Design an enzyme around this catalytic site. Structure first.
Site, mmCIF file in Angstrom:
data_model
loop_
_atom_site.group_PDB
_atom_site.id
_atom_site.type_symbol
_atom_site.label_atom_id
_atom_site.label_comp_id
_atom_site.label_asym_id
_atom_site.label_seq_id
_atom_site.Cartn_x
_atom_site.Cartn_y
_atom_site.Cartn_z
ATOM 1 N N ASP A 92 78.734 -66.075 142.898
ATOM 2 C CA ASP A 92 79.908 -66.782 143.389
ATOM 3 C C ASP A 92 79.688 -68.286 143.501
ATOM 4 O O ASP A 92 80.562 -68.993 144.014
ATOM 5 C CB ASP A 92 80.335 -66.214 144.744
ATOM 6 C CG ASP A 92 80.867 -64.799 144.640
ATOM 7 O OD1 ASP A 92 81.498 -64.473 143.613
ATOM 8 O OD2 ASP A 92 80.654 -64.011 145.586
ATOM 9 N N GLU A 93 78.554 -68.787 143.035
ATOM 10 C CA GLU A 93 78.219 -70.201 143.086
ATOM 11 C C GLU A 93 77.805 -70.646 141.692
ATOM 12 O O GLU A 93 77.338 -69.829 140.892
ATOM 13 C CB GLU A 93 77.118 -70.467 144.126
ATOM 14 C CG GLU A 93 75.912 -69.558 144.046
ATOM 15 C CD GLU A 93 74.978 -69.758 145.223
ATOM 16 O OE1 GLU A 93 75.210 -70.702 146.008
ATOM 17 O OE2 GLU A 93 74.029 -68.962 145.380
#
Ligand SMILES: C[C@H](CCC(=O)NCCC[N+](C)(C)C[C@H](O)CS(=O)(=O)O)[C@H]1CC[C@H]2[C@@H]3[C@H](O)C[C@@H]4C[C@H](O)CC[C@]4(C)[C@H]3C[C@H](O)[C@]12C
Ligand SMILES: [Zn+2]
Ligand SMILES: [Zn+2]
Lengths: 227, 700, 146, 153, 196, 50, 110
Positions: free
Chosen positions: G91-92
């Site tokens: 998610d990054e």
RNA sequence: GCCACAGAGCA
DNA sequence: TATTTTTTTGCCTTCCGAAAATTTTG
DNA sequence: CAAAATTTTCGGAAGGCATGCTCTGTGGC
């Protein structure tokens, strides 16, 4: 495995022989990413990162000079800086040192001053002996870490130690799929139902390795009685 | 070999050595009795004999062993001692003074069955095929089992990886005193601990109390030129500075300030520290002058072994190694018991003498020998019970052994034959795997690979091989002088800095000095052994990892004869074999010509033995006499045991001692508590050489 | 067995020279032991498989192994063909002496016949070192049972 | 001369090279002017050459001594039999062969000769005279090396 | 195998009572050249206990620390070396004269090691001054205790140290050794028969 | 399951020894070879395998 | 520090003294070594073992980019090899590795 | 008869 | 009376100063 | 703010515990 494993499971053994944490990597098809993630959990002593540690006496000041290797840091890809080693040295409570003494000289030099009839020399020798055994990166309870390539080709990072929470909190590791054969560790991290599942799975695995063919309902009864 | 050295005759040799030689040593240890009441009075023992008066031409009459078996008596011979004591105003000596009765072992040199033909055995109602080696006490025939112990007067280094500590222990054993010393590691620091010392002493202090007075010499002895050893050991040098101990007298003060030893005489604290260093820290090394070099070097090399163990844990000593273990026979155990018995007898006799001389009316010395008898039986019973009950409780040496003697099993001929040559392990409570219960490869040809019971005693109690010899103690001073003449530097004239730059020489575990050429020294010593100038049981072996050459002289070592191979050829030719078969050239004269020699386990380590003559490469040093020696007497009954599985051989080693059959030629003149006999015994078709050598086919 | 011995000797001299590549989780000693054990287990299984397919029908151990009444294929392969590697505490035969298992082998020898490979069958009779190694394994089994 | 009053730093060798440096150290501890059997033969030849050179270099030089380690029981010599302390006059010879090896012949027996242990510390020979009128301890010189004479078997 | 040169070996000096000291602290070679011999000031020797004590005056101009010595050690300026003479058999000190090797038997060898008698004197003086402020048939000693007691009770013999006397010693040894010539008795095998 | 081939060799050696009239040897790492006893059994009219 | 006194071969310890300046003093015999203007140091050279370049070999046969190296004062190289790698959570953002083709000095941007 | 001790049997 | 050896190994909790850490006074 | 009382942590010592049944013989009060 076998009878010693059953023994150390059915009792609440705080410390077991060879505990294994099986972390599942986010990037499961890259050797570089797997080894970078290993560099985040495997402990790296100061001896592994420092060219030399020395005791230096001057006209009125005495200090430990440590010169570290940025080349080895870049070659092993540790996300580590000089201030990280400084704060790691400061955090060592057994060394009896404080942040006021640690100073940075150049880009590679760390100076640990010692201030005061002969206690200065004894403290100086003790600090020099105990300094290259401090942990500047990695978890304090992880003995070692190995990337294992399974039959499917996906890579799992399996470690020896007792830091389940720190492994499943580490970036690059899926915390929803990390398990431990130790059961009190799972009880401390996840709860009592996870401990019950760990008991059942570990006993079933131990029985199935020897092929004894024990019905799982008895194992469930034992796990429920324990918890 | 079985005609001379045999497989039962270890018990006989040990008992003969104890009676003929060791009793004199025990007497000379405690010869003098002095009365505290009167300074002029002294009583001395100058010679001891068993079953033979000096005046008498022949041995005194003893009851036959079968009569003692039937009448529930004890087969024993009187102990005669020569006592010179002060009476009145003159010294008078008395020969043939009886102070007890030693229970003699059957078919020893003091027995009636010694070198007796079969007709005499039939006259005495004794079987000619009886192995002997047991004591008839109160009618019951009891056997003193052989004991495994760790090697005495040697440094044993052990480590606990889970605890992180290492320790080097020495078990000093001498006829004068026995003790145990440890050099342990705690918190990265090296300490010396002993039962007498209340607290652990730092190694720098105990080295300073000896002849060494400088820290550089201590570091050079312990570490040498290695930087890692210096880095490990540099912590202990600071303890001499922290506690402000810098002289020999100060170190002796510090040591003697915390010694729990209680003595008859009041001693100065410095004198007490000197006594603790001289006679308590290491007992087998004693000093009679102001020099402490040998003690200091012994402690320094103990610390060096500890440092080497701390650097890498693979330099520890294997506790299960047969070379690290010694075998206590009947003679050594009876010697250790008789030492305590004679000490108690001497103390009681001195107390009685002091009691009588307090009375002033007895101006005459009242013929003090007239008071021996009331205490004399205290020896005899103290012997018999210790063989009858089997309990060996000696508070002098803190010994609480139980189960030394066993009732002689008469379920079969092979059962009696095989209960002799059983070895009792030291650790009988070890329930772990790969410890004392594992079959070490070191016992190949020394101990049986199949004879062990199944159950709670599996792997602990074990049996000797067919062709083995157990060494008896030999004199070390001639070997010491031979070491000095062969070119060994003396310990008192060598550098401490260059001690580890050349090989060291160890006589019975004690650093005698340094040698410049180790291989030539070893070769010359082996040549002298093979020629016959020294004893054939002296073991020479060079350890390159320790940089040492070791010379073992003491007893308790297991040995095994082997054929020497020189230049790729066996030294035993066909002419020697045909001379042996013709009738001349016996085994002793194979030893004298240097064709065969005895190798213990440690010398086997520095050797390359060929099993068959077709397997000889020119790097071989020895040749096996015959392989089935690796199986014992019981395991020799099994036909084709190399075509079977090992558990089956073990189970039949267990069940061969329960077979019902003939017991002895006098089995119908015997009255035993339980005897199973077979009406029609038969010898097997598929025999074994071991069956013929142990005469199992005579009594199947 | 000759092919397996030659390959094991090739790995032994490769390890002695120092250019033996390591396993992902093991050092040089451990990967050498693992590889030698793998080859010895493979030659054991291959000789056993050649042996079993060659026995004729109405063979009593073969019948008893097929029924499952008593015995197995491994026992028949041990009696008729190579007994195989002896495993002690999960490893091969430990060095009882200094840097070797027995005095009848050279120092620093790691050949299969010097560390617990019983080439001989139970029918052909065991050599004294193979006899000793098999005795070690059997003694370990009895001690565990006790 | 004040350099001798500097703090003494002990000699330090790494553990991996502790066995290789010994050949250099044994030569460095003296003033500069079967595999094991062959190595010992080479070392014995070197020691024989060094012994011959040292014997030549101490000819007639005063205050020079060298310690012999002879057998404690020398071969018997008949009286002009004799005790090990009563030997006087010529007792033998030191013989040099063409190969460079040295042999010490005492009486009728030939013995080998070696250089013995190397000593880094200082040795001096002291003559002691204990007398009631005047007791004097006299210095005669210093010991330059040791040699050991061993019977051959 | 033929010999090209032989050097005569003679033994003399059966009454010389020759001793050899071994300074465990003084090195033999500094750099590449032999080290300078230390200057001996006083020598003491207990005869029956064989305790040698040698005093060497150490330099006071450089590296002396006058304060500590004048405060607690009574201004000591000499370092003493103590040793015990050990009877070593088979040791001979040899010299060479006209390429002839002359041997003199060595009686005892002493291992001279540093002694700190001023530290012991200060300690016993402190103990006496702290005990006197506020205090709060028997000769059964044998072995090491008797030796230590008789060494402590023994009065030291002050010796006159001297140097440059090697010429007279060489002259008397050569004079005694050169005249006599001994011929052998024992066979080669007879020596190997007893104490090779 | 127990692999006692030595019992089988003992049976054959005993049979051949009784038929030939001589006690046989079952010494470890040696003893009476199987081929000779099979030859004796064949010469006596019995099967070679006992 | 492992130094021994030349007079008696006993261990030398550093004392502060009354003057406040350290001296190599011997507690057995009257010996001192002043160290004013002299730097005494004892170095413990830790053993360095060979480490494999975990990022090495990943810049071969890859696309290039026009990004200035951080050491602009020493050189002005613009073309640099770059590639992507996921060493973080999903998610990054995926991190980016860059190697300058002239001066080296490999750096990860984000 | 009580108490320990010692050996033995079966996995 | 007073010289003087061990003879299983692993795991576990309770107690208790000692020391480190934190709170609490003056 | 630094002395001073209070609370928590961290080691080392001290007890407790370790397959089942069965059969003989010997010794000592
Ligand atoms: C023995 C070991 C230190 C070694 C030096 C200490 C330090 C880390 C400790 C574990 C962690 O605390 C997590 C966890 C807490 C639970 O409460 C009890 C179990 C767990 C598994 C702990 C057990 C044990 O206490 C460990 C392993
Ligand atoms: Zn000093
Ligand atoms: Zn750039």
């Amino acid at each position: 495995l076998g009878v010693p494993r059953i023994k150390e499971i059915i009792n609440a053994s705080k410390v077991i022989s060879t505990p294994i944490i099986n972390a599942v990597l986010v990037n499961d098809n890259d050797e570089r990413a797997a080894r970078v993630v290993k560099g985040r959990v495997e402990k790296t002593l100061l001896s592994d990162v420092a060219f030399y540690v020395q005791d230096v006496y001057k006209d009125n000041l005495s200090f430990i000079q440590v010169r570290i290797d940025l080349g080895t840091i870049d070659k092993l890809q540790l996300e580590l800086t000089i201030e990280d080693i400084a704060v790691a040295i400061t955090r060592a409570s057994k060394l009896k040192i404080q942040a006021s003494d640690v100073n940075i000289i150049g880009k590679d030099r760390i100076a640990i001053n010692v201030f005061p009839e002969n206690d200065v020399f004894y403290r100086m020798q003790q600090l020099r002996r105990a300094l290259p055994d401090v942990v500047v990166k990695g978890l304090p309870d992880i003995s070692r870490a190995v990337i294992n390539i399974r039959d499917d080709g996906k890579r799992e990072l399996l470690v020896e130690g007792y830091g389940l929470r720190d492994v499943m909190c580490t970036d690059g590791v899926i915390g929803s799929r990390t398990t431990t054969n130790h059961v009190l560790e799972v009880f401390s991290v996840l709860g009592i139902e996870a401990a019950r599942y760990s008991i059942i799975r570990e006993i079933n695995y131990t029985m199935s390795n020897h092929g004894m063919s024990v019905d799982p309902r008895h194992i469930q009864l034992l796990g429920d009685v324990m918890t | 070999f079985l005609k001379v050295k045999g497989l039962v005759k270890q018990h006989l040799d040990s008992f003969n050595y104890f009676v003929d030689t060791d009793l004199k040593k025990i007497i000379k240890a405690n010869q003098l009795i002095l009365s505290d009441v009167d300074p002029e009075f002294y009583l001395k023992y100058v010679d001891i004999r068993v079953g033979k008066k000096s005046s008498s031409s022949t041995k005194d009459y003893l009851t036959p062993p079968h009569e003692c078996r039937l009448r529930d008596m004890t087969y024993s011979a009187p102990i005669y001692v020569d006592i010179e004591y002060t009476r009145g105003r003159n010294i008078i000596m008395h020969k043939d003074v009886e102070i007890g009765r030693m229970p003699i072992m059957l078919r020893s040199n003091k027995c009636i069955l010694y070198d007796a033909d079969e007709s005499k055995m039939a006259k005495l109602n004794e079987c000619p095929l009886d192995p002997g080696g047991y004591f008839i006490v109160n009618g019951t025939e009891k056997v003193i089992l052989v004991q495994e112990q760790l090697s005495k007067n040697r440094i044993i280094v052990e480590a606990d990886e889970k605890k992180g500590i290492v320790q080097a222990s020495v078990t000093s054993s001498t006829h004068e005193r026995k003790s145990k010393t440890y050099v342990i590691t705690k918190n990265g620091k090296i300490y010396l601990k002993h039962n007498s010392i209340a607290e652990e002493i730092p190694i720098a202090i105990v080295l300073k109390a000896c002849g060494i007075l400088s820290d550089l010499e201590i570091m050079q002895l312990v570490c040498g030129n290695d930087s890692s050893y210096q880095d490990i050991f540099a912590v202990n040098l600071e303890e001499s500075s922290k506690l402000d101990i810098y002289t020999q007298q100060q170190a002796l003060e510090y040591i003697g300030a915390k010694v729990k030893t209680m003595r008859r005489q009041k001693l100065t604290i410095l004198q007490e520290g000197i006594e603790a260093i001289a006679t308590t820290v290491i007992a087998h090394l004693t000093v009679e002058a102001l020099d402490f070099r040998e003690k200091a070097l012994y402690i320094a090399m103990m610390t060096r072994r500890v440092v080497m163990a701390m650097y890498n844990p693979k330099m520890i000593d294997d506790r299960d190694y047969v070379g690290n273990k010694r075998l206590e026979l009947a003679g050594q155990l009876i010697s250790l018991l008789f030492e305590d018995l004679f000490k108690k007898f001497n103390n009681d006799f001195k107390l009685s003498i002091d009691k009588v001389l307090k009375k002033p009316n007895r101006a005459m010395e009242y013929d003090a020998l007239l008071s021996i008898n009331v205490h004399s039986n205290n020896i005899t019973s103290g012997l018999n019970r210790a063989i009858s009950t089997g309990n060996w409780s000696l508070k002098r040496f803190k010994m609480e052994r139980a189960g030394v003697t066993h009732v002689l099993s008469r379920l079969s001929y092979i059962s009696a034959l095989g209960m002799m040559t059983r070895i009792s392990s030291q650790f009988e409570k070890s329930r772990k795997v790969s410890g004392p219960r594992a079959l070490q490869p070191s016992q190949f040809g020394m101990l049986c690979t199949a004879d062990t019971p199944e159950g709670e005693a599996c792997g602990l109690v074990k049996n000797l091989a067919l062709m083995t010899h157990i060494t008896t103690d030999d004199e070390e001073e001639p070997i010491k002088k031979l070491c000095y003449v062969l070119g060994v530097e003396d310990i008192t004239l060598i550098d401490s800095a260059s001690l580890h730059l050349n090989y060291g020489v160890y006589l019975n575990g004690t650093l005698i000095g340094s040698i410049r050429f180790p291989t030539k020294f070893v070769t010359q010593f082996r040549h002298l052994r093979r020629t016959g100038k020294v004893s054939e049981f002296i073991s020479i072996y060079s350890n390159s990892h320790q940089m040492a050459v070791h010379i073992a002289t003491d007893g308790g070592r297991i040995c095994r004869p082997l054929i020497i191979v020189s230049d790729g050829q066996s030294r035993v030719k066909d002419i020697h074999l045909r001379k042996l078969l013709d009738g001349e050239l016996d085994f002793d004269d194979f030893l004298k010509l240097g064709l065969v020699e005895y190798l213990d386990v440690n010398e086997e380590n520095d050797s390359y033995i060929a099993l068959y003559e077709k397997d000889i490469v020119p790097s071989m040093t020895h040749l096996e006499i015959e392989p089935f020696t690796i199986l014992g007497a019981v395991a020799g009954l099994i036909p084709y045991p190399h075509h079977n599985q090992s558990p089956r051989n073990t189970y039949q080693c267990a069940m061969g001692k329960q077979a019902i059959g003939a017991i002895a030629y006098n089995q119908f003149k015997r009255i035993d508590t339980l005897l199973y006999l077979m009406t029609y015994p038969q010898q097997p078709m598929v025999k074994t050489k071991t069956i013929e050598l142990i005469d199992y086919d005579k009594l199947p | 067995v000759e092919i397996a011995y030659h390959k094991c000797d090739e790995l032994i001299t490769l390890f002695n020279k120092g250019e033996l590549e390591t396993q992902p989780g093991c050092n040089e000693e451990q990967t050498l032991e693992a590889k030698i054990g793998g080859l010895l287990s493979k030659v054991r299984e291959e000789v056993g498989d050649v042996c079993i397919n060659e026995l004729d029908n109405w063979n009593a151990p073969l019948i008893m192994a097929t029924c499952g009444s008593k015995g197995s294929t491994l026992n028949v392969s041990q009696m008729v063909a190579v007994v195989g590697q002896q495993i002690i505490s999960g490893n091969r035969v430990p060095d009882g002496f200094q840097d070797r298992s027995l005095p009848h082998f050279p120092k620093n020898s790691k050949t299969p016949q010097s560390k617990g490979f019983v080439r001989n069958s139970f029918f052909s009779g065991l050599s004294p070192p193979e006899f000793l190694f098999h005795a070690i394994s059997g003694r370990e089994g009895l001690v565990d049972t006790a | 001369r004040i350099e001798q009053l500097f703090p003494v730093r002990p000699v330090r060798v790494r553990h991996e090279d502790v066995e290789t440096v010994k050949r250099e150290i044994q030569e460095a501890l003296s003033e500069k002017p079967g595999k094991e059997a062959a190595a010992e033969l080479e070392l014995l030849n070197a020691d024989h050459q060094h012994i011959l050179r040292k014997l030549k270099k101490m000819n007639n030089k005063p205050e020079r001594f060298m310690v012999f380690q002879l057998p404690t029981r020398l071969p018997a010599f008949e009286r002009p039999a004799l005790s090990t302390r009563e030997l006087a006059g010529k007792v033998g010879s030191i013989r040099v062969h063409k190969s460079g090896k040295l042999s010490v012949k005492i009486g009728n027996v030939v013995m080998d000769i070696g250089k013995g242990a190397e000593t880094t510390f200082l040795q001096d020979v002291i003559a002691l005279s204990i007398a009631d009128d005047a007791s004097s301890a006299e210095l005669l010189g210093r010991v330059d090396g040791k040699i050991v004479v061993t019977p051959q078997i | 195998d033929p010999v090209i040169e032989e050097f005569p070996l003679k033994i003399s000096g059966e009454e010389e009572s020759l001793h050899v000291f071994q300074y465990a602290n003084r090195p033999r070679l500094v750099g590449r050249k032999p080290a300078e011999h230390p200057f001996i000031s006083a020598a003491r020797y207990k005869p029956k206990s064989h305790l040698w004590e040698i005093d060497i005056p150490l330099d006071e101009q450089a590296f002396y620390n006058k304060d500590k010595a004048e405060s607690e050690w009574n201004g000591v300026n000499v370092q003493t070396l103590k040793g015990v003479g050990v009877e070593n058999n088979g040791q001979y000190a040899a010299f060479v004269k006209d390429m002839q090797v002359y041997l003199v038997p060595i009686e005892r060898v002493a291992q001279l090691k540093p002694f700190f008698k001023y530290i012991d004197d200060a300690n016993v003086t402190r103990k006496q001054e702290d005990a006197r402020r506020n205090p709060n048939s028997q000769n059964r000693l044998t072995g090491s205790l008797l030796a230590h007691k008789v060494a402590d009770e023994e009065a030291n013999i002050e010796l006159t140290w001297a140097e440059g006397t090697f010429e007279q010693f060489k002259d008397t040894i050569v004079k005694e050794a050169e005249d006599k010539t001994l011929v052998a008795l024992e066979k080669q095998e007879d020596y190997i028969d007893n104490l090779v | 399951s127990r692999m006692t081939v030595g019992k089988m060799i003992e049976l054959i050696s005993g049979k051949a020894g009784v038929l030939n009239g001589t006690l046989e040897y079952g010494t470890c790492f040696g003893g009476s070879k199987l081929e000779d006893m099979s030859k004796i059994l064949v010469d006596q009219g019995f099967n070679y395998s006992g | 520090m492992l130094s021994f006194c030349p007079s008696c071969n006993n261990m030398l310890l550093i004392t502060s003294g009354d003057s406040g300046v350290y001296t190599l003093a011997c507690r057995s015999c009257p010996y001192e070594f002043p160290i004013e203007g002299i730097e005494i140091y004892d170095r413990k050279k830790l053993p360095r073992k060979e480490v494999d370049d975990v990022l090495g070999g990943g810049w071969d046969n890859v696309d290039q980019t026009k990004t200035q190296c951080p050491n602009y004062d020493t050189c002005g190289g613009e073309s640099a090899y770059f590639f992507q790698l996921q060493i973080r959570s999903a998610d990054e953002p995926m991190t980016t590795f860059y190697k300058c083709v002239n001066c080296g000095h490999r750096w990860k941007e984000n």
